[PDB]
Amino acid sequence: GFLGAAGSTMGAASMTLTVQARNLLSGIVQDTHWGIKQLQARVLAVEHYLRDQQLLGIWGCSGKLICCTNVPWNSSWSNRNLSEIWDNMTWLQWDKEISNYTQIIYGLLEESQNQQEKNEQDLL
Amino acid sequence: NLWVTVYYGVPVWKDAETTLFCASDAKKHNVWATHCCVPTDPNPQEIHLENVTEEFNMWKNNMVEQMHTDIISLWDQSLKPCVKLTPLCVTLQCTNVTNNITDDMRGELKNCSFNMTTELRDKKQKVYSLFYRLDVVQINNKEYRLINCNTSAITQACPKVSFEPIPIHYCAPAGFAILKCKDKKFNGTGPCTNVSTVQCTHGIKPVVSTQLLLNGSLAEEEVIIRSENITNNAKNILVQLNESVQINCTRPNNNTVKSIRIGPGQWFYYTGDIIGDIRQAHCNVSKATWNETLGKVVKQLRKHFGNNTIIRFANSSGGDLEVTTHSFNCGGEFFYCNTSGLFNSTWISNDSITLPCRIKQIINMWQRIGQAMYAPPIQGVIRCVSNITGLILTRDGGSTNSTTETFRPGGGDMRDNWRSELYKYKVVKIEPLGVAPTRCKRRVV
Amino acid sequence: NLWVTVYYGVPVWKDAETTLFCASDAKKKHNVWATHCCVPTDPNPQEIHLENVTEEFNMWKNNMVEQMHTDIISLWDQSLKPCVKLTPLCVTLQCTNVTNNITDDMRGELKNCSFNMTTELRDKKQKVYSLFYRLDVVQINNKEYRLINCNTSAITQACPKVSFEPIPIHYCAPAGFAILKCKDKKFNGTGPCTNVSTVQCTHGIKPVVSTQLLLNGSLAEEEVIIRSENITNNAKNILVQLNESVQINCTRPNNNTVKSIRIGPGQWFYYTGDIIGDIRQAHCNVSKATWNETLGKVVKQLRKHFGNNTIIRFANSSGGDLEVTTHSFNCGGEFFYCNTSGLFNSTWISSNDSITLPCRIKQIINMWQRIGQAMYAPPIQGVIRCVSNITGLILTRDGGSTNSTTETFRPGGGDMRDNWRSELYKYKVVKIEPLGVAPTRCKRRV
Amino acid sequence: GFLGAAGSTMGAASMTLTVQARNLLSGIVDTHWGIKQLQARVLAVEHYLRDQQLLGIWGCSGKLICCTNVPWNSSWSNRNLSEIWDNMTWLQWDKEISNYTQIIYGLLEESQNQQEKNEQDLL
Amino acid sequence: NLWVTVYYGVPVWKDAETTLFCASDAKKHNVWATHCCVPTDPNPQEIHLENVTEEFNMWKNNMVEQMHTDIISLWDQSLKPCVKLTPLCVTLQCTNVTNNITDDMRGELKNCSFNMTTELRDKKQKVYSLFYRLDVVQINNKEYRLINCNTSAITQACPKVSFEPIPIHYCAPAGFAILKCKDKKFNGTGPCTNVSTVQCTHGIKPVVSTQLLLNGSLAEEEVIIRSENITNNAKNILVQLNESVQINCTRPNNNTVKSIRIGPGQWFYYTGDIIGDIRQAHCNVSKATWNETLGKVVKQLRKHFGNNTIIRFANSSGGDLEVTTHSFNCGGEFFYCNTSGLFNSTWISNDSITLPCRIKQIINMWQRIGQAMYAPPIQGVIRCVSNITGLILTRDGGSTNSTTETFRPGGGDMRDNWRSELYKYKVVKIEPLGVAPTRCKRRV
Amino acid sequence: LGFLGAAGSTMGAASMTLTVQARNLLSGIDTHWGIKQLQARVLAVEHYLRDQQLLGIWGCSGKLICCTNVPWNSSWSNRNLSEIWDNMTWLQWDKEISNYTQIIYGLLEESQNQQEKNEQDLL
Ligand SMILES: *[C@@H]1O[C@H](CO)[C@@H](O[C@@H]2O[C@H](CO)[C@@H](O[C@@H]3O[C@H](CO[C@H]4O[C@H](CO)[C@@H](O)[C@H](O)[C@@H]4O)[C@@H](O)[C@H](O[C@H]4O[C@H](CO)[C@@H](O)[C@H](O)[C@@H]4O)[C@@H]3O)[C@H](O)[C@H]2NC(C)=O)[C@H](O)[C@H]1NC(C)=O
Ligand SMILES: *[C@@H]1O[C@H](CO)[C@@H](O[C@@H]2O[C@H](CO)[C@@H](O[C@@H]3O[C@H](CO[C@H]4O[C@H](CO)[C@@H](O)[C@H](O)[C@@H]4O)[C@@H](O)[C@H](O[C@H]4O[C@H](CO)[C@@H](O)[C@H](O)[C@@H]4O)[C@@H]3O)[C@H](O)[C@H]2NC(C)=O)[C@H](O)[C@H]1NC(C)=O
Ligand SMILES: *[C@@H]1O[C@H](CO)[C@@H](O[C@@H]2O[C@H](CO)[C@@H](O)[C@H](O)[C@H]2NC(C)=O)[C@H](O)[C@H]1NC(C)=O
Ligand SMILES: *[C@@H]1O[C@H](CO)[C@@H](O)[C@H](O)[C@H]1NC(C)=O
Ligand SMILES: *[C@@H]1O[C@H](CO)[C@@H](O)[C@H](O)[C@H]1NC(C)=O
Ligand SMILES: *[C@@H]1O[C@H](CO)[C@@H](O)[C@H](O)[C@H]1NC(C)=O
Ligand SMILES: *[C@@H]1O[C@H](CO)[C@@H](O)[C@H](O)[C@H]1NC(C)=O
Ligand SMILES: *[C@@H]1O[C@H](CO)[C@@H](O)[C@H](O)[C@H]1NC(C)=O
Ligand SMILES: *[C@@H]1O[C@H](CO)[C@@H](O)[C@H](O)[C@H]1NC(C)=O
Ligand SMILES: *[C@@H]1O[C@H](CO)[C@@H](O)[C@H](O)[C@H]1NC(C)=O
Ligand SMILES: *[C@@H]1O[C@H](CO)[C@@H](O)[C@H](O)[C@H]1NC(C)=O
Ligand SMILES: *[C@@H]1O[C@H](CO)[C@@H](O)[C@H](O)[C@H]1NC(C)=O
Ligand SMILES: *[C@@H]1O[C@H](CO)[C@@H](O)[C@H](O)[C@H]1NC(C)=O
Ligand SMILES: *[C@@H]1O[C@H](CO)[C@@H](O)[C@H](O)[C@H]1NC(C)=O
Ligand SMILES: *[C@@H]1O[C@H](CO)[C@@H](O)[C@H](O)[C@H]1NC(C)=O
Ligand SMILES: *[C@@H]1O[C@H](CO)[C@@H](O)[C@H](O)[C@H]1NC(C)=O
């Protein structure tokens, strides 16, 4: 079920990421002012879906739910043991723990992929 | 050693304010049912969130604000296609009804007449009708006018449109989820540890009332007392009962409804006459039950104020009828009942209570100026039975002295009637992209 | 050989028309402009200079102008919808002249009218006395009169609590679009501009409404700039943007009393009941020396297109009823129609004084040249004064003739579009088109 | 910054593709007023999706830089790499080959269909 | 050895209900032209399909319901800004117009006088006008009121607005397509093996009438008779024709129209007076043409009801004028013509038929009780010529197996007229995704 | 051919026209009138995205044709492969498997769910 893994550890939660993805659109697909409000709700849901998909594309992650990238992890963002992070901590806790650094990480992911694509075009 | 790894489909969320839509579970010409057209047929889902702790705050809950706004809209929209009564704002000639009137109703009904227009603009007819004194004011057999002729246009509500409350379920739009607090004794502001996710709320019946809360949910363990700031006076206290108090309301006479044409297809309904000796409207509560459910409130108030304090009840302070009395819609008519007999006792550590009531047809609804409505009279005898499931109380004075504290029934905003049901729900936005450290790297160069 | 390569995110664009949205600085609290333009602007202009980019601009074909003139005329109506209708006021009036302590100039301008108005209750009537300007009242045939619009339209009273005072308005592009700004110091409104930058919103432009003379706009950089779609075509107007501000001081000298009655439930009508002291005409003052220097600067710029061996003569307007024959403006809620002939009398051949312009005031206003609707401007109580900066003029030519070396210019004006062009001439809207194709040496590997 | 590369040469501008790609969609994220704004939002989305679909059709999905199997035709404007990439800007270039837009798009679509069929037949 | 393969862009579809948009080929005061503002392409670009069989059912076609609903909406929007004639529901004093009247029309016109409002609220004016008796009822020189005073406000239709039908086209939104049946004998309820796909329908004129359908398409090879349930007397029979019948309708009097302000910019138009002797309205149908046409219909009715079956035609059974007579509008005027002269025959095995017509000005429409429209009078003389391209018949009797059946004209529901031009079209949704077996696997 | 021009063609033959139909959903796209048209436009977008998401989840995001990791079941159909590709068209075929849609889709998601997991450990 949707968010069934919300209290699960980060590692365990990743076992079924798909349920959180299919329900971003299936829940959309399944008085004048009332009509306008409903259109705003539907349009916004689409716009948010697309934003996230574009970011993954820009960062070099396409149809995968999990992508490794080539940006090094900074100990200045977070410096903790991987065993705790993946086995004894949940994603809700984790998101709260590193919510400061999302803007910088995203910028770095974008730059790395941009350089990679140029290098690949030259190497062909 | 390790790099950034991106995960999509991460089961996390943040607080958010969005637009919710309503849904009915399926009578004809029911306003609520007509509007909340979306089926609630799919099984309600509920996913318990094991080991999830979340913070709820009913006083900053925007589900309440939306429900309030949606309700106002339904009333506006429903009264949009109904007969306007502008042509009735004329001088009335009125005398008192003195025939077979009990003392309690002396001076309450007036027999008025006026020269009204009809379909053909050049013609007029004399109309006789009965009005309650609360709807009529004196100008200088005396001359009177309808009470809203100086402030507001009046629209007659359509007799075929029913506003009877039905359960309504509020549902999240895609991208959002509703979290429910299941803790047994939650006071409205703080962490909740037994939580789950649902796609819609349970049904909430949009009952509109003042002072006493009718037909709501009951508490499961005990009477629960909630407020924004407990020791701060001039704040409403919402009391949720675990056992209800039955209240029986009635209008005992047989009213005869007549009608005339004002214009082309524009009908006006009014009380023509009254059959039988005249008696006042009233509501009954069992006396013993009322005393038992008051004692429970008193125990809980002492937990907050001290075991050695004295709790004194008193009636409302004064002001407009809407807040000084208990208002409700019974059988389609608007009642304003005197609760002075309910909040009279002092608590120190087959009988019933009859509350007299008044009926009013010109209603300035939702604490607004302008947009007045006229409630058509209902033919016959009115009777309804309802459950008191809670109270709106205020504490006042703020004195120390003897430590006796005084509580009074309060009026309150209409928002408080929904806050009392929506206290267990919160709306959050889902955010699928997460980032975390790990030892993998890509191998394409 | 070379191969086709596809790139996404290519920084190119094409001219486009799209709906813009209205934004404000989001700081009175009962102002139509502020109420409508609910979106706050970002305090950071976020301007990106486009180094080595040349772009052609055309102010006479600018869709931004057209939108500004569909927004103002839809905004004005939604603000008047929830207000008092004065159809109960369209009754026969019994009127005499106001002759007590009146200056010569006002002898026939103000009338004392009496009529039978409705009351809260439909069966009653009340006698009302009020004063009207003659421009609002016509004779029917102590004589009988009617309000001027009883034969064409309903009159809606503007709500006294709603201000229409212009505030700076920012027009902002929707996503996928960008606004290019022309920064060349002396751009004559058409053609290539080489100092170009990209912005998200325009600067704040105040939607000031006027006719022959512009008010409270921006100033020209360096010299006075004269812009016209076609100088040769005398059917077109010439927009002159002054490089310095010429100040005008306008007054409505009488101290009046505003009274009100109910027409019906919840509905109040406002009118002028009394005037205290001597009755005097409205006046606008402009410095005489400043005005003569201002025209001389305009004349030199006009000469660039006509010759320096000619005569430039100014003259007053003709035709156009009251609306294009006067300088119209709104100060304090009063609508002034000033006589500008005193400003355009000079012939140019190659403290101290003020030029005083008498003005008339009227309360029943037709606006945006519509004829099926009208507004009643409630009177404002007390003596009214305002000041303003001209920042530009609208001129037209009389026409040429056989063997004439004298160019004659008159003040005039067309629709409101001219006033909006004056501020929007430097902005252009384009659509961004990210897909590009080019040749290269990279072949897709298969 | 967005479009700061507009005056840069085609080659130099190739490294700012992520700025323009992000700007549209992150930029995306009274009855008549409400309708007009919804229409504007819907169009921004429709345009985004058409470009993405088209890249998918050509086999360029997920990439900002894509090499294809359509050769450059001598019919289309023919100029040296030394001027196309090193001297000209994208604004100039787009005008130079504006005619051939539909021709190129049709060729790209056909090449991708044949390649996908060939992979399935080989499997 | 086989695995499932996913394919996208697959040429398949499912039946669907969607909203079609209206488009029209490029005066400008016409309501249809104004509403269907979207231009059509000069080339419809129809694609034939080969080896495709589709099942059509016109009776459950939702293109018909949408067309009906959109028409109602357009009429209501068109009248939104027009004058509300509430000041006219006053007592009228009326006498009969007796001068210059033929026996026909002897009691049809009345000369009414009333006190109407003026620009100013303090004045009244006396107005004289001529009304048709169908719009005026006695109160009890007698006192009268307008027929709609006790049910609705009457809105005057704006004289500058034209309701003249212009062919319009219904077009599919993206994701949808319109399938067309090109079977020459198709009867509305079954498989059609000759089909094509279009995005827009042919232009259809939104002509509103009962009994005899005007200015529609003709059958190409033979008269086609269509019915949902042919043996059920509760259903209407829609008879198309393969040859049209020309009908000539006039209003012979030369009317002089006058107008008065009833308020601040609000004008009321009325009949003024009449030039020439008073004569009635009428329609001419050639008798020979009519009999040939009807004989063809009878032959085919026998194909459905038996070779020895006698087919008798008769007039309508009764009810409101709207449903008992041939209601139509031409020249902008509203006509109610008798069909008793067309259906008076029994079939066993230049002589025009003149149908008397009446004119009505206060029109209820679409059977909505609470609405009313006042059609302003038209100056001068009215003439129109139109094509009868089909009939709506309501057969009855035969309950005793008498071998004689009776066919009467009828049906006040406009939906049946819209059905007649949409029977060949169906709307489907395109479904591009699907899964099929193949000899391949996704290799890792 | 053109859009749906392959409607009666064999399944194999029609497989080369997939891009015509694939592109048309987007390339082809009174207060209440405006609202109804706006609703229609929003809905077309939602359907487009729904199908694209399913293809993404199943591991076929960039292709018109994908072999998968789910075996063909005898539950779905027992007809010859040659009758399916050479004799029938897509309309006729689709009618034979009308209620297997939900099971196949669930199986396809599961194959992706397992297939992508191994890569993170390998990297
Ligand atoms: C708290 O909750 C209670 C319980 O739901 C509410 O009480 C109900 O109130 C409604 C509305 O006033 C009552 O509904 C009326 O019932 C009449 C028939 O009553 C008999 O038949 C029913 C059959 O189901 C029995 O249950 C009932 O006991 C009786 O034997 C109808 O005739 C009424 O119809 C009216 O409106 C329609 C509108 O379309 C008209 O056509 C009709 O002619 C007529 O005017 C109506 O449906 C209901 O009976 C009450 N229930 C009980 C148990 O008494 C309280 O009102 C609620 N509290 C508050 C404050 O709202
Ligand atoms: C079935 O189809 C036929 C057509 O095939 C329809 O009949 C036509 O109906 C239209 C509309 O009523 C008629 O058009 C009108 O003609 C009037 C006379 O025009 C004459 O002069 C012009 C040249 O100027 C010639 O082209 C024309 O043939 C005539 O000789 C006009 O006066 C009318 O104009 C109206 O609007 C203008 C607006 O500016 C006003 O100024 C006018 O005063 C007036 O109010 C209009 O153009 C057409 O003539 C009819 N043809 C036939 C053969 O009858 C049927 O009505 C249709 N059936 C049904 C049921 O709808
Ligand atoms: C409200 O009305 C109900 C009846 O509709 C009352 O309940 C009845 O009371 C009598 C007298 O004690 C009993 O004989 C009946 O058996 C009861 N009937 C039911 C259904 O309970 C009830 O007491 C009234 N409530 C109040 C507060 O007056
Ligand atoms: C990330 O690492 C750099 C050193 O390369 C350091 O300067 C920076 O501060 C780190 N990030 C944070 C959040 O400090
Ligand atoms: C009529 O009733 C009013 C109260 O509404 C009362 O004050 C008054 O004295 C009564 N008059 C008579 C004559 O009964
Ligand atoms: C209960 O009330 C106290 C006192 O106001 C408050 O501190 C606490 O957070 C509330 N909530 C819970 C869950 O205890
Ligand atoms: C008001 O009506 C009365 C009616 O008797 C009339 O005499 C009087 O002159 C009217 N007053 C005005 C100002 O028109
Ligand atoms: C503009 O041209 C100069 C050379 O004259 C060059 O140095 C500069 O980088 C160019 N600007 C851009 C944006 O490429
Ligand atoms: C290349 O261009 C020529 C001239 O326009 C044209 O005839 C030829 O068909 C083109 N090549 C391809 C593969 O279409
Ligand atoms: C296309 O070719 C024409 C000449 O045939 C040329 O003028 C044009 O600039 C080229 N590209 C554009 C801008 O369409
Ligand atoms: C006037 O005409 C009607 C028919 O419409 C008739 O019933 C009535 O008797 C006539 N009255 C006169 C004036 O004879
Ligand atoms: C099918 O219908 C079309 C109509 O466009 C016609 O041209 C064609 O000959 C017909 N084919 C047959 C014989 O079914
Ligand atoms: C039309 O044909 C179908 C057979 O396809 C038949 O079932 C139906 O009854 C027919 N309709 C008529 C003419 O009654
Ligand atoms: C049908 O014709 C007969 C002829 O005698 C007539 O009496 C009857 O009233 C007509 N029916 C209708 C509805 O007009
Ligand atoms: C229809 O079937 C015939 C064989 O009878 C075949 O030749 C033709 O190509 C088919 N049409 C289509 C569009 O596949
Ligand atoms: C279909 O697949 C299921 C596996 O989920 C299997 O149990 C069943 O036997 C299969 N059916 C056939 C007959 O292929």
Side-chain angles (χ1 to χ4, degrees), chain E residues 46 48 180-184 193-196 220:
Chain E
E46 178 178 345
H48 182 62
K180 179 168 70 173
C181 180
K182 331 195 272 173
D183 181 343
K184 299 292 179 179
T193 62
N194 187 345
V195 175
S196 65
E220 295 181 0

Side-chain angles (χ1 to χ4, degrees), chain E residues 57-75:
Chain E
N57 186 339
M58 76 181 189
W59 295 103
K60 297 183 179 180
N61 194 328
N62 289 320
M63 294 177 77
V64 173
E65 185 63 19
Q66 181 179 340
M67 183 174 183
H68 185 71
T69 299
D70 288 348
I71 292 169
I72 299 301
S73 180
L74 180 58
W75 270 93

Side-chain angles (χ1 to χ4, degrees), chain E residues 10 28 81 93 114 132 137 164 183 200 204 212 230 243 251 307 337 412:
Chain E
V10 175
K28 183 68 180 295
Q93 293 183 27
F114 62 97
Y132 292 95
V137 296
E164 182 181 1
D183 181 343
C200 297
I204 297 170
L212 302 174
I230 195 66
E243 185 176 3
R251 187 189 72 186
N307 283 55
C337 300

Side-chain angles (χ1 to χ4, degrees), chain C residues 46-60:
Chain C
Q46 294 300 320
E47 178 175 337
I48 299 170
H49 190 72
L50 304 178
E51 293 177 350
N52 304 356
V53 177
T54 299
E55 184 76 50
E56 293 177 350
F57 291 78
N58 186 336
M59 70 182 282
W60 307 104

Side-chain angles (χ1 to χ4, degrees), chain C residues 2-10 12-14 36 48 50-51 53 78 175-176 435 437-439 442 444 446, chain D residues 2-3 7 10 17 20 24 28 30 51-52 58-59 64 66-72 84-85 90 93-94 97 112:
Chain C
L2 302 176
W3 295 89
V4 175
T5 174
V6 177
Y7 296 91
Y8 181 76
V10 175
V12 299
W13 56 84
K14 302 287 165 55
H36 180 69
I48 299 170
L50 304 178
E51 293 177 350
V53 177
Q78 293 177 335
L435 289 171
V437 177
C442 178
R444 179 179 293 178
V446 179
Chain D
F2 180 68
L3 304 175
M10 290 171 65
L17 295 175
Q20 285 75 235
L24 171 61
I28 292 167
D30 183 343
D51 288 341
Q52 292 296 307
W58 296 345
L64 299 174
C66 180
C67 298
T68 75
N69 289 120
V70 176
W72 195 259
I84 292 169
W85 290 104
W90 279 102
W93 178 250
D94 186 67
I97 59 166
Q112 186 63 19

Side-chain angles (χ1 to χ4, degrees), chain E residues 2 4 8-9 35 437 440 442, chain F residues 21 30 64 67-69 72 85:
Chain E
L2 303 176
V4 314
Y8 183 81
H35 184 70
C440 64
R442 187 162 62 188
Chain F
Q21 295 169 162
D30 283 332
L64 296 171
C67 300
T68 73
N69 293 115
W72 189 262
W85 290 105

Side-chain angles (χ1 to χ4, degrees), chain C residues 146-161:
Chain C
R146 60 176 172 82
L147 296 179
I148 194 165
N149 288 328
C150 283
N151 54 341
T152 64
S153 64
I155 303 166
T156 299
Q157 180 174 253
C159 291
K161 300 296 186 182

